[PDB]
């Protein structure tokens, strides 16, 4: 919300036009339609079909953000017993494979405990969270100068 | 009518699936087909005339038997010839 | 199904697919082999080659790669693009 | 009728089922090199060697970066052959983790049967060195013979 | 593995014990109740950590107590 | 050995039962002492084998549960036709569909809200409706407003005749177990006295009414100089006119000559090209054939007659060498087991409903049902999200038969003993072809944005990179194009338009339908939406077969269905239960359904709906960019969800704000989802306890002693606001999107 | 063990005259001049050295024949052990 504030405080600044932020920071649909839907257009297009542009890095680590933070989801709604009965049928699987049995594993291949599943999860929403704005802060300020 | 091709097709299959199931070559109520489509006897509990066992359920059940196959007939040869 | 006798029957200790064939090749084939892979035998000797003789290989063609060969050593061949406010 | 527990144990986490105790199929797996066990440890490792070194010129020669080009023979074969080297160092790293210098053999000596078998030499540290220099030779011959076959020779195949 | 621990407010319930799923708990004599019982856990090693006995126990607060500890093949209930 | 046995009031119809809230289980029968008690009342009110153990009253209650859900669709139904009666401009639709939207909801002007009743057209004001019953009513030959009063209050009728029988079916004259376990009678009247008489009835109906009120709305003939519907059954000429073969009346159905009914009885395939809907002497002769196909499949078990098939004759025999006592108890379960029954009814009817939504954008059963984009976009949308939450439903209540109603004495060696005794087989390979799709799609999608992301469009998967058509469905494609003229002869066209025949359906100027190519990102997508059915399989399944035991856990029947877990122990054995792979599998219903409906907005906003101009020009929406953008994850967010989220974000100050507000309050429950999901209960118990002393001090104490949500019940707000919130989140995003562009 | 499908080398002839004696008959459904030599004309006709069959007529009666073929040479394999086992 801080740096929300901050980028559109200055991206309307930068560019003269601070009547878009008094106009529109009052309600949340000028957060989405002119900060994050506006200033996101050459963002997502750093590439296309048609070709890539220098964002095109930006606009990946835009895309991760979106994979790593939501990968934390998986640690974070999903908890820790399914993937015990999973990563079970797992060993057995393994356990039982012809020309893969002869391979073995030292450890016991178990699921990630609790405070483990909260921390992994913590830590993808934390660098997906980070990726997500810096990728979009640093290709909606940096490709629109201004 | 009475001399065309649909009218002695759909008598002829209600009657041959009726003499089916009153002489004992159909299923009926009264006996029952197998896994091994093989005729045994039982007490459904109606109760006719009738000294074979064929009953008012039959009469429907053949007559439909000699509907749904007289159908079939009569449209497959109007298609055919 | 527990024997007191056979402690590896009775826990699952079973070559399952296994065979107990002595041999199926000939001499010709088997002192080949013995011959050529016979510097590659021991682990701690084997695994100190491997890493320096693969961190050469990729400094190698990494190196002497062309332009067609890969796009990194071909370089820029436009006009670079100018970014906005002059930059 | 058809299915069987694993040699009558109800209790073991298996069945024997047509794709684990087929007439076909346990033949199959009793004749593949990793289920020899008194052949030595370095000449069935060559054959594992082999087999996977040459099917992986061809997902690297008509999928990879430099297909397009006329260095795709040598491009490819590198390729593969570096995926070779690689898993080279993971058999070589697993043998040291389990196994360990002067132990017995992590293997089932029993067979199907009540028989009485030799332990298999290929779960010791001595025997899983020897598969790793048999992989390493087998692997990168297997590279190189599928690209003599295909980019030396040339010989004629619908996709190449 | 796990250390189950008993206090002295329990009050011989049984219930520890009987919600025990791999056999950890058991009634020993004692003389500071109604019942004359006291839950101990001798085979402590053996304990999941599930806390189904803590879940049972009607004392406030808990006269058994699973602190999770260092964790085993027997505490992390495997098969393999 | 099938009759009726009823008997006669076995609870007195009193208030006394309604002032006691918790009176169906005993632990809610003392009364309130906490607030998860409030919980529990709503959680365990409709599980009725919670309350009691006897299935004879189970089975009352379900009957009666049966017609008050039987009651209450009826008033939504009464209400629906009362809007069209009242509140829509059925009339002025009904005069020319192609200009003016399809609008059957008037607000009130209150607090501003009165811009949302917008320009609809035919001089009227009000919400734009995108439910389909418009074009419903144009196919069933509504004409005028009073029908539709008429029809809503004989729906209010029979909602009432719903509630009076579902009183009356427990406190008058309840059913007997034995009566609901006669399942031959009630598959014998379900196939022929319910669906059979049902396609008949419809399929009369369709004969008089529909099919001369349609011909005639098809030669422009205004709708109040249109003949009444009685008009056609009473004036025969009338109805003769429009169709010479009822001057025979009658008389060819029992002579077999049915082929003189040729002229109303077709099997002509593909649209109107008037309209854009389907030919309704086809949905005629369609509805006459499964029903003289219905009828037939009605009398196929055993009642009493001595005729039939005992079915439990059926799957006793039904016993093989790779099974061997297989099938046997089967019918054990399916008689004694609610849960088991409303699991199979509940993935025919899901896995139904996604039939439904595939046969109805493919081939449109109502007149200008596609060329109304909005009305296509949201009935395949609505149907696609109740068959995906009724197939989860269906592996939610396979699992509640597992934890309570699997009986291990009598199903010894049959098919369900076996599936539970390799369940380890079956979960892990499973996982195996999930992960392997998750790979071969994903990943491929994965590489599709690096490579396009590294200035590589030659190194895609594209349709001038890489190419992966799918070669089975270009040709069944083909096969179902190239078929009238020697697979299937006496048909006049094809099945459907999106298969390849041609006939460019023009009506009002916007495509009703064309062949819909299917390329690289169709295959990428289709193994995308079979990854995410596969994983949503594999979450529910492995809830279905671990729900007795485990390896982790052998006692989890014991536990029961919604228990949390067994504790911190085996490492922790957090959502080990049947319940939480529901939760989860509920999540992957969300990730399946959503991709499915985002290919299938994106697929005919750019492939099939759009505008056709002079000389035969067809401009789509999102002119041909699903070929090339919705291989890359980069055009999905970008040529997908920001290009076409350009109408859900501005429409402030519009007719469809209200979309905007719901889109940004859909974002809202999706994130206040999150705190659910990610949260427990300690901590909220804990911050609970500090409010309860800022209560303390202050002497405003509540008896009733606040405690933070279960669990089981934490676990299930956070899925109800997520699929709440996301699902609203993709209507207001489609309703806005696909009204505005359309 | 080692029998799970046994041989019996009659199922496969029986099978055999199970897919060509009533199914090498013409019929006038469709006008097909024989049901099996229009589906044996896809080698006949779309045999090609190495640039084979692409969106062709072969792959629908091919993927009948053999369906057909796996309903009535597998139904012997039920028939067949069916009068062995205690079935029916
Ligand atoms: C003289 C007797 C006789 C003859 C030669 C025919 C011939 C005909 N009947 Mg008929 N029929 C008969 C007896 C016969 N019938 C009887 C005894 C029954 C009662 C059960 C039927 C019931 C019946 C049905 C239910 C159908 C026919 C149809 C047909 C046609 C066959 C279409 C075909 O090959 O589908 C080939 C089909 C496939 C290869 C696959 C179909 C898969 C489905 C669609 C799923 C043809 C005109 C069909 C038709 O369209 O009538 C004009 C049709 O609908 N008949
Ligand atoms: C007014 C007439 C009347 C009266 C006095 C009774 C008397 C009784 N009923 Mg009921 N019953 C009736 C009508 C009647 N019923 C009808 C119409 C039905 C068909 C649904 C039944 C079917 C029935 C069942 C199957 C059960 C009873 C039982 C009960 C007992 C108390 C249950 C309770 O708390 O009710 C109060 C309940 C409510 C207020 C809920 C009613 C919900 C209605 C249907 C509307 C639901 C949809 C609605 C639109 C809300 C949707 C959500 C909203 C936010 C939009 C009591 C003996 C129970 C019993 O004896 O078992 C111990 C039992 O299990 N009844
Ligand atoms: C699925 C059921 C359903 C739904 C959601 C609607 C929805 C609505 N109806 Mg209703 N309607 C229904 C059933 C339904 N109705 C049935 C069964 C009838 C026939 C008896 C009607 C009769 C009807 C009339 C008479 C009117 C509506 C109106 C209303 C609106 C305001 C209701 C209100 O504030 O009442 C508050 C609660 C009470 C007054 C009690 C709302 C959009 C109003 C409307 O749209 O006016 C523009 C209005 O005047 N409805
Ligand atoms: C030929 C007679 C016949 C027909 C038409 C039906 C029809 C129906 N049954 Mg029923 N049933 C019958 C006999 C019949 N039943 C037999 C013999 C058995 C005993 C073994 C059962 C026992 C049974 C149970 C236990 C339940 C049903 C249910 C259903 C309903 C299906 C659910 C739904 O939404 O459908 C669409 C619904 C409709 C189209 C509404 C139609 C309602 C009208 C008033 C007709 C129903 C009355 C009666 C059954 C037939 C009268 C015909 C009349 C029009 C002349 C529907 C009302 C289910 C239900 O919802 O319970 C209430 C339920 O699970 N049936
Ligand atoms: C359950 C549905 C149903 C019902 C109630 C009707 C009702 C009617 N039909 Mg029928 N009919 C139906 C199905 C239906 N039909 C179907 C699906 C077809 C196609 C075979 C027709 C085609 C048809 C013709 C050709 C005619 C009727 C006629 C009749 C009338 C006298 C027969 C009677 O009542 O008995 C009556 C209005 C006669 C009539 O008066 O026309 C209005 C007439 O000549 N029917
Ligand atoms: C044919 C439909 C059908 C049938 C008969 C049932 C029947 C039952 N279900 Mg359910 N089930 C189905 C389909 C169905 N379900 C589907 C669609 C799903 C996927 C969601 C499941 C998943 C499932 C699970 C996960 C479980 C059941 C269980 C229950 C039982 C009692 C639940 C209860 O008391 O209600 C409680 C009702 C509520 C709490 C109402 C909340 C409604 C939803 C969740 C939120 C509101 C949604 C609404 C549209 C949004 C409006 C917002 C607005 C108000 C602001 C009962 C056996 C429970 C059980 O113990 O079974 C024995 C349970 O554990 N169900
Ligand atoms: C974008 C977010 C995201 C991602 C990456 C994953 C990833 C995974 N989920 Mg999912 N899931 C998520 C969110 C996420 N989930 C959330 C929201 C929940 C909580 C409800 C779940 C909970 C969960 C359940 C409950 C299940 C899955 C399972 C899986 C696996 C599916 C198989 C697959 O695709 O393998 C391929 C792997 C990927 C596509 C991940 C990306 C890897 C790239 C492509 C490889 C290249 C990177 C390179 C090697 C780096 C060097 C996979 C590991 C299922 C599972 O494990 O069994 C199959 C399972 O049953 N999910
Ligand atoms: C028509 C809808 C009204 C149906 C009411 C049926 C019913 O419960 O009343 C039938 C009730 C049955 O009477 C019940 O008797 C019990 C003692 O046996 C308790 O006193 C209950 O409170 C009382 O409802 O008869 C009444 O006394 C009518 C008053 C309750 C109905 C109020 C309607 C509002
Ligand atoms: C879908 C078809 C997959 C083929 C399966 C099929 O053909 O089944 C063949 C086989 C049939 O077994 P039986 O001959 O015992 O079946 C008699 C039936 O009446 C079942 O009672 O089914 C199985 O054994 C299941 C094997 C699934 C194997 C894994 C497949 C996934
Ligand atoms: C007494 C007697 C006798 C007689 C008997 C008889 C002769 C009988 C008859 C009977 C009959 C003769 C019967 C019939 C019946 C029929 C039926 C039962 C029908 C049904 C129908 C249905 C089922 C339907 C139809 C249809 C179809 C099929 C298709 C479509 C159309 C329709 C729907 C129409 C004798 C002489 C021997 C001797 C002495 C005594
Ligand atoms: C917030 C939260 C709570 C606390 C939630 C509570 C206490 C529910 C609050 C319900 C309402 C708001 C209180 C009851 C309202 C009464 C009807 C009184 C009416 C007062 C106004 C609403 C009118 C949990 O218990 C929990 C448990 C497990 C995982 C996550 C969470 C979680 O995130
Ligand atoms: S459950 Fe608690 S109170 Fe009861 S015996 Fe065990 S420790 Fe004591």
């Given at each position: 919300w801080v740096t929300f504030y901050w980028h559109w405080k200055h991206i309307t600044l930068w560019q003269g036009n601070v009547a878009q932020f008094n106009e529109s920071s009052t309600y949340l649909m000028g957060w989405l339609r002119d900060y994050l839907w506006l200033n996101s257009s050459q963002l997502i297009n750093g590439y296309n079909p048609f070709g890539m542009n220098s964002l095109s890095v930006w606009a990946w680590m835009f895309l991760f953000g979106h994979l790593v933070w939501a990968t934390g989801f998986m640690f974070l709604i999903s908890w820790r017993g399914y993937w015990q009965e999973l990563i079970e049928t797992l060993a057995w699987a393994h356990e039982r494979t012809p020309l893969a049995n002869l391979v073995r594993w030292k450890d016991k291949p178990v699921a990630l405990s609790i405070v483990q599943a909260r921390l992994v999860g913590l830590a993808h929403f934390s660098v997906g969270y980070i990726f997500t704005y810096a990728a979009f802060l640093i290709a909606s300020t940096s490709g629109k100068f201004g | 009518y009475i001399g065309s091709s649909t009218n002695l097709i759909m008598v002829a299959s209600t009657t041959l699936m009726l003499f089916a199931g009153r002489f004992g070559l159909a299923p009926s109520a009264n006996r029952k087909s197998t896994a091994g489509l093989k005729l045994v006897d039982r007490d459904s509990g109606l109760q006719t005339g009738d000294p074979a066992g064929f009953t008012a359920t039959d009469t429907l059940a053949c007559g439909a038997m000699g509907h749904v196959i007289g159908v079939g007939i009569v449209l497959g040869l109007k298609a055919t010839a | 199904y527990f024997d007191l006798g056979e402690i590896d029957n009775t826990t699952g200790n079973w070559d399952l697919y296994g065979n107990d064939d002595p041999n199926r090749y000939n001499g010709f084939q088997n002192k080949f082999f013995e011959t050529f892979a016979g510097a590659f035998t021991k682990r701690g000797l084997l695994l100190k080659f491997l890493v320096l003789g693969g961190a050469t290989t990729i400094g190698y063609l990494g190196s002497t790669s062309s332009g067609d060969l890969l796009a990194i050593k071909n370089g820029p061949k436009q006009a670079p693009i100018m970014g906005p406010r002059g930059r | 009728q058809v299915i069987e527990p694993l040699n009558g144990d109800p209790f073991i986490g298996g069945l024997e089922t047509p794709v684990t105790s087929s007439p076909l199929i346990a033949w199959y797996l009793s004749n593949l090199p990793a289920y020899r066990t008194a052949v030595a440890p370095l000449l069935r490792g060559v054959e594992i060697g082999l087999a996977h070194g040459y099917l992986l010129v061809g997902p690297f020669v008509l999928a990879g970066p430099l297909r397009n080009s006329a260095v795709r023979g040598e491009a490819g074969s590198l390729a593969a052959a570096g995926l070779v080297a690689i898993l080279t160092m993971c058999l070589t790293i697993y043998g040291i983790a389990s196994f360990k210098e002067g132990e017995a053999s992590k293997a089932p000596s029993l067979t199907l049967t009540g028989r009485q078998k030799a332990a298999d030499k290929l779960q010791t540290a001595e025997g899983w060195a020897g598969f790793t220099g048999g992989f390493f030779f087998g692997g990168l011959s297997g590279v190189a013979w599928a690209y003599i076959l295909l980019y030396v020779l040339n010989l004629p195949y619908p996709v190449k | 593995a796990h250390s189950v621990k008993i206090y002295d407010t329990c009050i011989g319930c049984t219930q520890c014990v009987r919600a025990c799923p791999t056999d950890v708990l058991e009634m020993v004599p004692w003389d500071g109740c109604k019942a004359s019982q006291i839950a101990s856990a001798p085979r402590t090693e053996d304990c999941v950590g599930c806390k189904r006995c803590e879940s049972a126990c009607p004392t406030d607060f808990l006269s058994v107590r699973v602190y999770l500890g260092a964790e085993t093949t027997r505490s992390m209930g495997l098969a393999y | 050995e099938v009759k009726i046995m009823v008997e006669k009031d076995?609870?007195?119809?009193?208030?006394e039962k309604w002032a006691?809230?918790?009176?169906?289980?005993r632990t809610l029968a003392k009364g309130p002492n906490t607030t998860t008690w409030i919980w529990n009342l709503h959680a365990d009110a409709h599980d009725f084998d919670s309350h009691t153990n006897d299935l004879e009253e189970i089975s009352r209650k379900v009957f009666s549960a049966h017609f008050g859900q039987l009651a209450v669709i009826f008033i939504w139904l009464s209400g629906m036709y009362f809007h069209g009666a009242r509140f829509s401009n059925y009339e002025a639709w009904l005069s020319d569909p192609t200009h003016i939207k399809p609008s059957a909801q008037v607000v009130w002007p209150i607090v501003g809200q009165k811009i949302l009743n917008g320009d609809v057209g035919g001089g009227f004001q009000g919400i734009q409706i995108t439910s389909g019953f418009f074009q419903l009513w144009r196919a069933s030959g509504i004409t005028s407003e009073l029908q539709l009063y008429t029809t809503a209050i004989g729906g209010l009728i029979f909602a009432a005749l719903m509630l009076f029988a579902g009183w009356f079916h427990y406190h008058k004259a309840a059913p007997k177990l034995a009566w609901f376990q006669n399942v031959e009678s009630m598959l014998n009247h379900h196939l022929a006295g319910l669906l059979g008489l049902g396609s008949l009835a419809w399929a009369g109906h369709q004969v008089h009414v529909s099919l001369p009120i349609n011909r005639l709305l098809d030669a422009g003939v205004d709708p109040k100089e249109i003949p009444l519907p009685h008009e056609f059954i009473l004036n025969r000429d009338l109805l003769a006119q429009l169709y010479p073969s009822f001057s025979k009346g009658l008389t060819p159905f029992f002579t077999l000559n049915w082929s003189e009914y040729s002229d109303f009885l077709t099997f002509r395939g593909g649209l109107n090209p008037v309209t854009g809907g389907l030919w309704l002497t086809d949905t005629a002769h369609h509805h006459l054939a499964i029903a003289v196909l219905f009828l037939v499949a009605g009398h196929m078990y055993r009642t009493n007659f001595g005729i039939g098939h005992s079915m439990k004759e059926i799957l006793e025999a039904?016993?093989?060498?790779?099974?061997?006592?297989?099938?046997?108890?089967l019918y054990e379960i399916l008689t004694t087991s609610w849960h088991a029954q409303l699991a199979i009814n509940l993935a025919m009817l899901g896995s139904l409903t996604i039939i439904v939504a595939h046969h109805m954008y493919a081939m449109p059963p109502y007149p200008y049902l596609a060329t109304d984009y909005a009305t296509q976009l949201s009935l395949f949308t609505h149907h696609m999200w109740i068959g995906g939450f009724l197939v989860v439903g269906a592996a939610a209540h396979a699992a509640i038969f597992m934890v309570r109603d699997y009986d291990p004495t009598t199903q010894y060696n049959n098919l369900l003993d076996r599936v539970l005794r390799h369940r380890d087989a079956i979960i892990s390979h499973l996982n195996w072809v999930c992960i392997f799709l998750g790979f071969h799609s994903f990943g491929l999608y994965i590489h599709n944005d690096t490579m396009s992301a590294l200035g590589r469009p030659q190194d895609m998967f594209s349709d001038t990179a890489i190419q992966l058509q799918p070669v089975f469905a270009q040709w069944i494609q083909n096969t179902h194009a190239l078929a009238p003229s020697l697979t299937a002869p006496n048909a006049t066209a094809s099945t459907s338009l999106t298969w390849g025949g041609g006939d460019l359906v023009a009506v009002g100027g916007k495509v009703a339908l064309l062949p819909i190519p299917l390329g690289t990102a169709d295959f990428l997508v289709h193994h995308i939406h079979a990854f995410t059915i596969h994983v949503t399989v594999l979450i529910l399944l492995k809830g279905v077969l671990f729900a007795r035991s485990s390896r982790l856990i052998p006692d989890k029947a014991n536990l029961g269905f919604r228990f949390p877990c067994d504790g911190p122990g085996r490492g922790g054995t957090c959502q080990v239960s049947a319940w939480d792979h529901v939760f989860l599998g509920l999540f992957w219903m969300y990730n399946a359904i959503s991709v499915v409906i985002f290919h299938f907005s994106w697929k005919m906003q750019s492939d099939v709906w759009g505008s056709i101009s002079d000389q035969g020009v067809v401009t789509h929406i999102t002119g041909g960019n699903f070929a090339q953008s919705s291989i890359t994850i980069n055009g999905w967010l970008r040529d997908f969800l920001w290009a076409q989220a350009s109408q859900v974000i501005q429409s402030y100050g519009s007719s469809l704000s209200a979309y905007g507000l719901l889109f940004l309050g859909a974002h809202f429950v999706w994130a206040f989802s999150l705190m659910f999901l990610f949260s427990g209960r300690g901590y909220w118990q804990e911050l609970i306890e500090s409010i309860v002393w800022a209560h303390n001090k202050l002497k405003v104490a509540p008896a009733i002693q606040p405690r933070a949500l279960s669990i089981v019940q934490g676990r299930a707000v956070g899925v109800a606001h997520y699929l709440l919130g996301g699902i609203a989140t993709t209507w207001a995003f489609f309703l806005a999107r696909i009204i505005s562009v359309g | 063990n080692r029998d799970w499908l046994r041989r019996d080398l009659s199922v496969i002839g029986f099978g055999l005259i199970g897919w060509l004696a009533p199914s090498s008959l013409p019929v006038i459904n469709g006008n097909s001049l024989t049901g099996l030599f229009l589906g044996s004309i896809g080698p006949e006709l779309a045999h090609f050295p190495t640039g084979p069959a692409l969106?062709?007529?072969?792959w629908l009666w091919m993927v009948t024949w053999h369906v057909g073929l796996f309903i009535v040479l597998t139904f012997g394999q039920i028939g067949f052990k069916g009068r062995q086992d205690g079935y029916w």
């Open positions: - | - | - | - | - | 076995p609870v007195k119809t009193s208030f006691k809230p918790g009176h169906f289980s039904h016993k093989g060498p790779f099974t061997g006592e297989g099938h046997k108890g | 969106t062709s007529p072969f």
